Every structure is written in C-alpha cells, then in structure tokens.
C-alpha cells in the first residue's frame, strides 16, 4: 500500500515480456505510462505485479478482444472490472457493489439500432445539427422490419405449436380455391376495402362470414394471421378465421439474441437478492399542475412519501391542464413561460421536503400536452417517440434535486437483469375507436388490451396515418424482448395490474379518478404491486 512513482522505461521490459509474448498485446508509450502509474500507486517497489498484469490481460482478452491496450480507455475499463470482481469476491477497492453502476435509464434516442437481416440475423447498426433526421429508406423499411420480427415470432411459435405454413401473398395468384394461411398487415385499400399487406404483395379480403378470436383487439395496422380460400374470379381472399400472432416468452427471445458476461450475470443475480427492499412508486396520469386541487393533493402525497422515500418516483405526462401552443396575447398567458412558472411552483412544493428528493431518482415522462410535442399536435396524439421535456423548463426542478432524469414517453429502465418499459398513452380509447366490426367486463377489456399489445409485439400497432412515428426511432416501440415489467399508463382505462406471458403490465390510471389521488407502488424484488388511494 506504499505509494511510489515508477517511470515507464524501467517497467517497459517486464511489461512487454508478458503482454506481448504471453498473449500478443501491443503496448503504446502513453498506455505504458498509465500502467506504470497504476502499478506505482497500488504497489510499491514494482516487483510483485505479475499477477496484476496477468489478470489485466486475461480480462482484456476475455471481454475487449483487440490490440493496442494502451488507449487510456481499455486499461481503465479492465482496471475497473478487476475492481468490481475483487469487490464481489469480498488492492485499490474492497467495498460493496453499488446498484447505481448497474442501474440506468435508456432514452428513445440512445438505444441500439437492431435491424433484422431477413433470412436469419439480428444485426447491429449503432453528425451535425440535423443529424437526427431519419432517411427515406428508414420510412421504407419501418414496416418491413416489424413484419420480419412478427414473422420470426410466428415461425418460432405457431409451427411448433399449431403445422400449417405461411404462404406469402404473392403466391396466391394462380391458385384457384386452395386454402392458405397468411400473415399480413391489416389495412384499408385506397379503394376503401380491407386488405392485407405483405412484403411479397397485397390481397383484398372478404371479411364477411369471419370468426375472429374474441380475446384480441383488431385494428387497421395490426398484423394478423388470416386463414381462408383464395378466389381468382375477383382476386379476393375469403377469410374464415383471423387471429393475432401468438406471443413469446422473454427468456425464449434472450437465447436467440444471446445478449447478457457470466460475471455481470452473477453480480446482477446477487444484488437481486441483496436489494430486496427497493420500492418504485408510479404516480397517476395527468398531473395537471395548473389545477390547485391537484397541487394540494400532490403536497399530501409528497409529504407521505417523504417519511420513506422510494427508489424511483416516476411522474406521468400532461403536466399542464391545457395544451401548449403559440398564443397571441399581451398577458402572462405566454404558454411557454406559464409552463416555466408551473415548474417553478412545483419546485417550491418539492424543495420543501429535505428527506425526499434525496437518494431518489425522479424520472419524468411527457404526455400529450407537453412542450415541444404539443406545439403542432395541439394536445392530440402526434409523433409517438416523444422527446423529453426541454431542459430550458427544468432549471429549478433539476437544481432542487440531484438525480432527476427527463426521458422519452416510451422509455426503458435497466434496473437489473429485468427491463422495465414506461409508456404514457391512451391506448384503450384509440383501440375502441378504430376497432373494426365483424359482420360474422372491464377486466376483460384490460386483458384484451394487454393481449393485443403483447401479441402484436409493438407498443403502438397502428398505421402511420394514425400515429406518426420517427422512422429511425421505431425499435424503441418494438417489444422484441418482451420486457418483464411494463408501465402501460393510460387515462381512459380502469386501473389494473395483469401478468401475461411472463410480463407484468401495470396501469396507474388517471391521477384523480373521482376524488382520490391514486398512485401505484412497485416492488421489483417481490414482483408485487399495490395501489395507494389518498382522499383529497
């Protein structure tokens, strides 16, 4: 533990002798200097560092897998990894593992681009002021990628469970009366009649005399599994039974993707048991800060949480009563600055609690009436991958706390080996409005909604003419791994908590249902939820 400074020239012989000869690692001058600094700091007289170098190189070859170790990033990374493995074994550090280094929240703009090579591959894709503008090919392939994902899901589930094959729509032309099973995107033709769209083509469908699976919502833009007899007399597909694709368990998708290292899995599993007492509190929807009654109720809720602050306090969308837009007036209407005043008022009612706002990440989720998204939509369901609340309106709130995250509407949480997805949207209303009728209670409707969302595998299985989506930011809506926990926030659906296909779906509902400021509590360790209604 004796500190010492050792110059790179004397350490150079032994360093190379092991890094280069034993394993084949090239060490640069700057990297050699950094390694000499590390060895001098964490050991004296620089004699018994052979095991340290061996551990460094073996970790580097096991994880990083490249050359030129002296990049100031590879060396630091391997030293840190050595630190955590020594910590979990319980030197430079001998403390306990902290979940903060394994807890992260992923925005819609910072995920990994995963485009599926149509045959069999899930590839990885990963520049100026207008560097966020999607390209045209992104719009072209937006639905193709979704179809390929659904087709892979069907090829894994249906054939191994039910064994009719899937015939591409282009294969129905010459056939006169044979039976086919089509997987296509239900949509309305420009001529005004329903049809299914496939990468190979499209075909009109005669929806009369169809028996649909009643446990699903059927809407244009959702991908269905129709079955019927093609007719070449009028080029129509007389569908008999149409149902949504079967869902998949998350664990099944993980071995196909094959994404985790063993040490990271062990550490995450260990802190899963160690961190038993962590509480996630999910507030209600439509926190209308403009309303004085809701403002007073929020004070009582924050006071109650101040006694025992939770791990995360998630705030739902539509923070203001009226949609924000450019207002022509000489008063303090000023829909921009009035938002700033509302957040400043929130800061007053939030900085008053010293016990709260400390050791509590505060994630904020935007809604239909938030800045930069309500400017054009005027409070309607506009572009789905909503950008976070602008930082220009969060000066006081961010100054008051120390860990506050402003995230996208379809945000992702990486608290542990499990993934949590938060989504604020009135899915039930749109589903009911755009559900198509077949010419041929509340808990049942909630189950229908959850089943439709999970079977579709997409957060919004809707057409581009009903819910515009940023073309490149579409993977942020795809439920390819089917995350374990999903906060399907809503304002037109009754509060519920359901589990399906290994996924826990929780809907806190509106903040004020009749007279109570409802909010939800989530315990990741026990996977148990409970609502906390508080009277006004």
């Amino acid at each position: 533990v004796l500190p010492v400074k050792i110059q790179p020239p004397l350490l150079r012989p032994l360093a190379y002798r092991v890094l280069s000869r034993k394993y084949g690692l090239s060490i640069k001058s700057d990297g050699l200097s950094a390694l000499a600094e590390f060895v001098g700091t964490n050991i004296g007289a620089n004699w018994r560092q052979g095991p340290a170098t061996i551990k460094f190189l073996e970790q580097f070859a096991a994880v990083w897998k490249q050359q030129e170790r002296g990049l100031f990033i590879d060396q630091s990374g391997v030293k840190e990894v050595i630190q955590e493995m020594k910590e979990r074994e319980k030197p430079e550090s001998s403390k306990a593992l902290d979940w903060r280094d394994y807890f992260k929240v992923i925005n819609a703009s910072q995920q990994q681009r995963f485009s599926y090579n149509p045959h069999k591959m899930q590839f990885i894709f990963v520049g100026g002021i207008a560097g966020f503008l999607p390209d045209i090919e992104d719009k072209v392939q937006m639905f193709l990628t979704r179809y390929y994902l659904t087709n892979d899901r069907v090829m894994r589930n249906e054939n191994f469970q039910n064994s009719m094959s899937i015939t591409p729509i282009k294969n129905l032309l010459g056939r006169d009366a044979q039976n086919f099973l089509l997987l296509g995107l239900l949509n309305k033709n420009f001529k005004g009649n329903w049809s299914l769209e496939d990468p190979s083509g499209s075909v009109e469908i005669d929806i009369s005399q169809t028996i649909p699976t009643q446990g699903h919502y059927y809407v244009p833009g959702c991908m269905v599994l129709v079955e019927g007899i093609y007719y070449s007399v009028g080029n129509k597909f007389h569908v008999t039974s149409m149902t949504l694709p079967p869902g998949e368990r998350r664990e099944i998708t993980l071995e196909t993707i094959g994404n985790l290292d063993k040490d990271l899995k062990i550490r995450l599993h260990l802190l899963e048991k160690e961190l038993t007492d962590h509480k996630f509190v999910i507030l209600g929807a439509n926190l209308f800060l403009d309303d004085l009654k809701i403002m007073t109720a929020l004070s009582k809720i924050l006071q109650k949480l101040n006694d025992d602050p939770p791990t995360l306090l998630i705030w739902q969308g539509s923070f203001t009563s009226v949609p924000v837009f450019a207002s022509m007036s000489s008063r303090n209407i000023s829909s921009s600055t009035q938002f700033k005043n509302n957040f400043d008022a929130l800061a007053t009612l939030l900085s008053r609690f010293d016990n709260l706002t400390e050791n509590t990440t505060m994630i904020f989720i935007p809604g239909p009436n938030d800045l930069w998204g309500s400017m054009v939509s005027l409070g309607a369901s506009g572009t789905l991958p909503q950008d976070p609340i602008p930082s220009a309106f969060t000066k006081k709130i961010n100054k008051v706390c120390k860990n506050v995250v402003w995230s996208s509407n379809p945000t992702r949480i990486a608290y542990l080996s499990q993934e949590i997805v938060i989504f604020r949207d009135d899915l039930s209303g749109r589903f009911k409005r755009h559900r198509l009728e077949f010419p041929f209670q509340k808990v049942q409707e909630t189950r229908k909604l959850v089943k439709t969302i999970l079977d579709q595998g997409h957060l919004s299985p809707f057409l581009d003419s009903l819910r515009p989506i940023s073309w490149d930011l579409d993977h942020t809506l795809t439920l390819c791994p089917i995350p374990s926990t999903m906060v399907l926030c809503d304002t037109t659906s009754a509060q519920f908590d359901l589990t399906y296909n290994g996924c826990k779906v929780i809907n806190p509902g509106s903040f004020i249902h009749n007279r109570r400021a409802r909010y939800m509590e989530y315990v990741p360790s026990s996977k148990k939820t409970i609502q906390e209604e508080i009277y006004i």
Binding site: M328, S335, V376, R433, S465
Partner: protein, 813 residues
C-alpha cells in the same frame, strides 16, 4: 331576480354540476342566488333507439345535423359514472359528439343575461331555499337596458414588477384612499383630468371620483403587508359596502385573487388583466379607469353577456358567445371544447389525422411577384377587410370542407354586424375586426381547423379574383400579398394618374364580390426598380426617392456606400432617359433603351480603380476591417471577391429590366473582363445572398394586422414591431411562433408521402422495396430541404439571440 341580470356567474360549483353563484341585479339591490343546470349532451340517436333511460329521457336523432370530419340525454350529474352507457352499438356513446360546455357557459349560451322568474311568490319562495333550476325557471328576457345606472366600484388595480417597487394599490369611489412626492404629479395629471372627468360626467354618467386624493406611501416588505394587509383592507371595504360594490380588479396573474381575495370579493368582479416615470402609470390608470366602464356597459348592452366577461381580447369571447347562440337557434351541434384548443368533435379530434394535420399546418399565402423596371406609373394599393369582405361575399362529398350551414350562419351574423356598424354601431365594428382576428385563434371557444382552412382558401381565391379583375381593367400586377397590391397602370404620364386611379377603384367596387373590400392608394411610383418586397427603389410621390435594398447588407462595409451611391446614379440615369423619351415622343422596347450609356464609362473606370485598390489592400492588414463579409441571418454564400459581389449585385439590378437586357449584358461582360472572368461563368452568376424564413399570418395584438413576418430578410425594426402601427412585439411570442414553425416542418417531413423517382406515382402500400415501374421511392420533401431550414433557424437564433429557439435546436440533437 325579476328582469335582473347576473353581474358575475362565478363557478360556485361546490361539486354540484349546476349550482353556481347568480348575483342578479334585483330592483332593490344585487343579491346572491343559486341556480341548477342540467348537463345537456347532443348525442343524437343515429339509427339506434336505446330504451335504457338511465335518468333523463333521450331525444331520438336529436333532429339535428352533426359535424363532418332540444336537449337529448339531459342528465344532471355525469359524475354518476364516467363509463356512462358505453355500448358502441351504432352511435350510442360510440362517438361522443356531444358538448363539453360546463356550467357558467350553457347559461350564457342559452339563457339571456337578463332573466325574470316567471313564477308566483310561492314558487319564488320555494326556489329560494335550493335554487332556480333553468328547466322550470329563468326564461330569457329583453335586454333594452341590461346594465344599471349607479354602481359602486372597488377599484383594486395592481401592477407588480421584479425591480422592487410594489403597486398593491386600492381605490374607493368615495373613500379615495389610494394606499400604495406623488401629489405633485397626481395634480399634474389632474390638470387635464378635469376634462377627462367632464367627458366621464357627460358620457359615462356612472361614478364620480373624490377630489382629495391622498397617497399613502407604505412599503409592502413581506407577505404580512403584501397579502395579509390587502386582505384585511378588502374585507374592511366588503363589510363597509355589503355586497354593494363591483370589484374593478387588475392583476397580471389571478392566483393572488383565488388565494384569498377572490372569495373575499365574491361580489361582482371583473378581471381587467392589463421609478418616477413608472409613478405616472398608476395615476394614468386610476384616472382612466372611469372611461372604460361606459364601454363595458355598452358591450354588455349590445352583446347578451354578463359583466363576468374577461377583458383579454374580449371580442373573441363575445364572438364565441354570439356564434354559439346563433348556432343553437339552428339545429347544429356545438364544438365548444373549452378545456382544449382543438374542436369538440367528440373523441375523434384527439387522434392524428393526415388531412386534419395538413389543413392545420398549412398557412403559406401565395405571392405574385414580378421583378423588373416599371417606367409606367404603378400604384401602391393597400387592400383591407379582405377576410370580412370574403366571408360576406362567399355566398355569391368534399370531406376536407367545412359545414356549409355553419358558414352560412357565420355569413349572416357578419352581415348583421356589418350593416349595424355601417349605421352608427360601435360594438358592431369592434366585433367585425375581432372576428377577422379570431377565426385563426386556437384560444377561441369555438375555433375549428376546418373553418380556418375554409376561410384561408376563400381569401386566397378572392385575392386571385381581385388580381384577375385588375388585369382585365388594363393594369398588370407586380405584387399581391393579401395586405397590399401593386398595379402597373399603363398611363405613362404621371399627371394622368388621379382620374385613372379613381376610375379603377370605383370599377373594382362595382363588382359585388369586392363591395365590402375597401382599397386606398398609399404611394404613386413614377419609376420603380422592383426585385422583391425588401429589394426595391424608385421615385415616389415623382419627387421623393427611396432606396430600400436588402442586398446592400450582404456587401463588405467598404462597398456598401459604393452600392448605395451607384443605385442613386442608376435611378437618376433611368429618370433622365425616361424624360428624354417622353420629350421626344411628345416589354419589347420601353422608354429606357440607352440609360446605361450615361454611366457605362464612369462605372467601368470606377470598377478598374476599385479593383486596383483591392489588389493593393486585399492582403495587407489594417484593411481587413473593410474587406469583410457581414454575417446576417440569411447568409449562405461564401464570398471570395467582395468587389465581384458588388458588381454582380449592380449588374443584377440593372438586368431586372426586360427591355434593356442586351445593353446591360454587354456592360456586364465588359465589367467581368476586368476580373478576367467569363461572361457565363458560374461564379459570376448572381444568387440571392439571403434566404427566407416567414412566420405566416402573424397577428398584431393591438391593431389586428395580419402580416407574414420574415426574419432572414426584413430589417430588425420591421419584425419586432408592427407595420401599420408601431407597437412592439413580445420576444416570447416570436420565439414561440418560430418554434411552432420548426416543429411543423419536422412533423411535415416525418409524415410526408413517398413517391416514385421515375413515374412520380405516390406510394400507396406500406411494404414495398420500390415502385412497380422499377423506380426507387423518394420523398416529396427532401431531407436536404429540412436540413437547410434547420440551419436557417439556427442562424436566426444565434444572430437575434433567441434563447428558447437555441434551446430547441440543442434539444433536437
């Protein structure tokens, strides 16, 4: 309550949908009354008879017409159940399509402000205990004299500021105790306040002010005097005149009221919502408070509205209330949607629709602009009342069109207000101008995107018809932008202009379509070199001359005076040539055919001298302060030879004329020979140095002027202030509108329709590698266009110092 108007209809809900305060001005004095109002819903039973009959009988089909995109279901407490009777069985709560109008609103819409309880004394006493339900009470009554005669006031104006001076001032009709060296300035304003009160005592005849105005200089250090002292003073005044005073409240933010003051003054309340130098503001406001009381009385007399109407663009609320009344007289469902700017189209208004989105974010007004030199006399005709005249004369399958019946209702109402204002009618004209301005106001309580789009198309087509009419009259158009139109009269002689112009205006007014369209000629141009609105010069009335060339701002500071001087030289040469042609006599070929010969040789020699001077001093320091290209919001061009840019601009403004193209091309070739540049070289071609960034249909909050503000081209003084007036514009409003346009551009790029790159057939399917004609898909809005627009926005924000716009740009990436 007998023929008594409620002064304020404040929402005394107490959780009851229908219970609210009614301060009806009874014959003796105002008294607090409670009402009861069922929540009417316009859910017409479309092809489905539902016999459920939960609480109230439901009318079948409502005998009305819905909104393409007399009280059915008259419940009383929807709180009973939010889920209500959701069935989705052929329009039985399948689509709401009802009314969101809460209490305090349906009362004004249906019941007149003045009302009389058409019941006996026993029924009156029975209704005293619980309230006066509108179902069996409160018939609408005539409003010949709706207001009162002598009403006490409780003036409590307050103008806070962050500098550190508190304006928690209160005024009394007789107490005169204004509690805040002010006596001298107060008397100074009193010196003409004798005349002001004489006007009040001859036109208002409502209240009088005591002459002993005592000013109490008290410093409201903290809340103890900021709020508690004000509350105790106002409760002392309240117990002084018991429910016998009208609160004239002025406060930028109303939360001070609703804290404790509002329920301290439940009596009739009005929300005006409007260091030594700032002292005069208080005395001016207190001594002018006696002027608009008569205006409010007149407004409430004409418009059937109580005194609870807010003064923030009160014309918008008046128009909403009157339009709702005229629409309720007809069997048309309303689209109120008080909570949100979007129309109350049931529930279909909350989801994205491509057509609705397009009609919303499309306000670009076509401009007809012809560039050239016009030796003929051209008139700067300025149109006015285009929207009003358009809706009035619009009388003279389509899913994108507004309802024809609602438009007819609007036309009839506008005709009524118009004829009224024509005869002496103050409020009538106020409301016509206000309607012109509201149609496009999302804050309106009846705003409809379809209606605004319909009005926009009607205005576009009316302007096109006006242009065609002027062309037929024998005058070509060189500019038309919905606020002004420039016509090229064929009369060469400037003397023969007045009679021709008057004949033209009369002939335009003869057409029924433009009868209400008022036109006035602003300026006469004997000569005009027109490139754009912001790049023009010429002789104006024949003796004044103007040189407004935005191209000059993009030249190096040394050459800006050279361009300015040579513009005057060119204009004078053109004038001399025109005079010579007119003297000799008294487009293929006009009066100008050799105007370049006057200054060709001096210009060439000056350019040679300037080129030698530049070659001497281009690289040497201490001169780079002159040979520097200015940075402007529209700057997008890299300049290597600033003198070449100067000669390019001069040659372009000379090439504007169509007749003298050849003699100016020869001059340009000779000029370019100096730089050893070819005549048709790419670098020698003139490209506009400035881009454009227009905020369409920007509205001036004072004079109601609808103009397209351009930020990359207009001078800074012409964007922060209006045109017809000279009042300033809010920085926050400009930044908000710029952000709105930026988000509209982003959304329009994201929701664009792809089309084939070879046959241009629009893409119809969702999964398709390419067009069936073997052509790759391409967008109708290229990505490069949006990138350029974003760069323009960033340049404007960085130059003008728009902080919120910079925050938006940063938040994009």
């Amino acid at each position: 309550y007998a023929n008594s108007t409620w002064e304020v209809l404040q929402y005394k809900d107490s959780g009851e949908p229908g219970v609210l305060e009614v301060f009806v001005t009874i014959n003796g004095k105002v008294q607090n009354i409670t009402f009861h109002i069922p929540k009417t819903i316009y859910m017409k039973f479309k092809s489905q008879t539902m016999p459920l009959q939960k609480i109230k009988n439901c009318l079948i089909e409502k005998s009305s017409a819905s909104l393409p995109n007399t009280l059915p279901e008259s419940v009383f407490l929807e709180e009973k159940e939010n889920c209500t009777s959701i069935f989705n069985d052929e329009n039985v709560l399948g689509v709401f399509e009802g009314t969101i109008t809460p209490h305090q609103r349906a009362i004004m819409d249906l019941g007149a402000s003045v009302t009389f309880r058409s019941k006996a004394m026993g029924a009156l006493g029975k209704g005293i205990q619980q309230g006066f339900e509108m179902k069996d009470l409160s018939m609408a009554e005539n409003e010949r004299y709706l207001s009162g005669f002598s009403m006490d006031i409780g003036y409590l104006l307050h103008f806070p500021t962050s500098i550190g001076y508190e304006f928690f001032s209160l005024f009394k009709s007789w107490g005169d105790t204004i509690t805040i060296n002010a006596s001298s300035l107060g008397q100074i304003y009193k010196q003409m306040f004798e005349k002001k009160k004489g006007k009040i005592e001859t036109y208002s005849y409502l209240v009088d002010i005591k002459e002993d105005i005592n000013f109490e200089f008290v410093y409201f250090t903290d809340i103890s005097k900021l709020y508690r002292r004000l509350s105790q003073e106002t409760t002392k005044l309240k117990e002084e005149r018991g429910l016998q005073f009208l609160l004239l409240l002025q406060s930028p933010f109303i939360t001070k009221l609703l804290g404790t003051i509002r329920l301290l003054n439940q009596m009739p309340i009005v929300k005006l919502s409007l260091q030594p130098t700032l002292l005069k503001k208080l005395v001016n406001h207190v001594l002018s408070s006696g002027s608009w009381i008569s205006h409010l009385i007149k407004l409430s007399q004409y418009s059937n509205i109580p005194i609870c109407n807010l003064r923030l663009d009160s014309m918008d609320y008046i128009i909403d209330v009157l339009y709702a009344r005229k629409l309720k007289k007809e069997n048309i469902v309303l689209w109120w949607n008080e909570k949100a700017p979007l129309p109350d189209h049931g529930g279909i208004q909350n989801d994205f629709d491509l057509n609705t989105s397009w009609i919303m974010n499309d306000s670009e007004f076509p401009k007809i602009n012809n560039s050239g030199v016009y030796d003929n006399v051209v008139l700067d005709v300025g149109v006015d009342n285009l929207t009003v005249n358009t809706i009035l004369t619009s009388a003279l399958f389509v899913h994108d069109a507004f309802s024809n019946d609602a438009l007819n209702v609007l036309r009839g109402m506008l005709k009524e207000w118009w004829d009224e204002a024509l005869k002496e009618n103050s409020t009538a004209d106020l409301l016509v101008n206000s309607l012109a301005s509201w149609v496009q106001n999302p804050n309106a309580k009846l705003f409809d995107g379809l209606l605004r789009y319909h009005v926009h198309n009607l205005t576009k087509k009316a302007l096109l018809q006006l242009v065609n009419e002027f062309s037929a009259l024998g005058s070509t158009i060189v500019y038309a932008d919905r606020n002004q139109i420039l016509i090229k009269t064929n009369k060469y002689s400037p003397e023969n202009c007045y009679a021709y112009s008057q004949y033209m205006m009369k002939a335009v007014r003869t057409n029924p379509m433009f009868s209400y369209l008022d036109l006035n000629i602003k300026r006469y141009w004997d000569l005009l070199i027109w490139m754009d609105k912001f790049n023009f010069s010429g002789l104006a009335c024949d003796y004044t001359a103007v040189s407004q060339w935005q191209l000059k701002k993009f030249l190096s500071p040394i050459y800006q005076p050279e361009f300015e001087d040579w513009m005057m030289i060119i204009l004078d040469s053109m004038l001399k040539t025109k005079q010579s042609y007119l003297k000799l006599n008294s487009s293929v070929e006009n009066s100008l055919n050799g105007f370049s010969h006057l200054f060709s040789k001096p210009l060439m020699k000056r350019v040679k001298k300037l080129f030698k001077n530049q070659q001497e001093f281009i690289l040497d320091p201490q001169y780079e302060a002159d040979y520097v290209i200015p940075v402007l919001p529209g700057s997008h061009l890299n300049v290597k030879n600033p003198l070449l840019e100067l000669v390019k601009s001069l040659c372009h403004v000379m090439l504007l004329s169509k007749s003298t193209i050849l003699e100016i091309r020869t001059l340009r070739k000779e000029l370019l020979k100096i730089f050893e540049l070819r005549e048709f070289a790419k670098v020698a071609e003139f490209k506009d140095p400035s881009l454009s960034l227009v905020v369409p249909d920007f509205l001036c909050e004072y004079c109601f002027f609808i103009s397209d503000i351009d930020f990359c081209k207009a001078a800074p003084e012409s964007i922060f202030s209006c045109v017809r007036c000279h009042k300033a514009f809010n920085q926050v409003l400009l930044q908000e509108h710029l952000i709105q346009k930026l988000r509209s551009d982003i959304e329009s790029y994201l929701i664009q329709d792809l089309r084939c790159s070879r046959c241009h057939k629009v893409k119809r399917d969702y999964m398709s590698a390419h067009c069936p004609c073997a052509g790759a898909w391409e967008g109708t809005l290229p990505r490069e266009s949006i990138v350029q627009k974003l760069n323009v926005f960033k340049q404007v924000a960085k130059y003008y110092g728009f902080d919120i716009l910079l925050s938006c740009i940063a938040d994009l990436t």
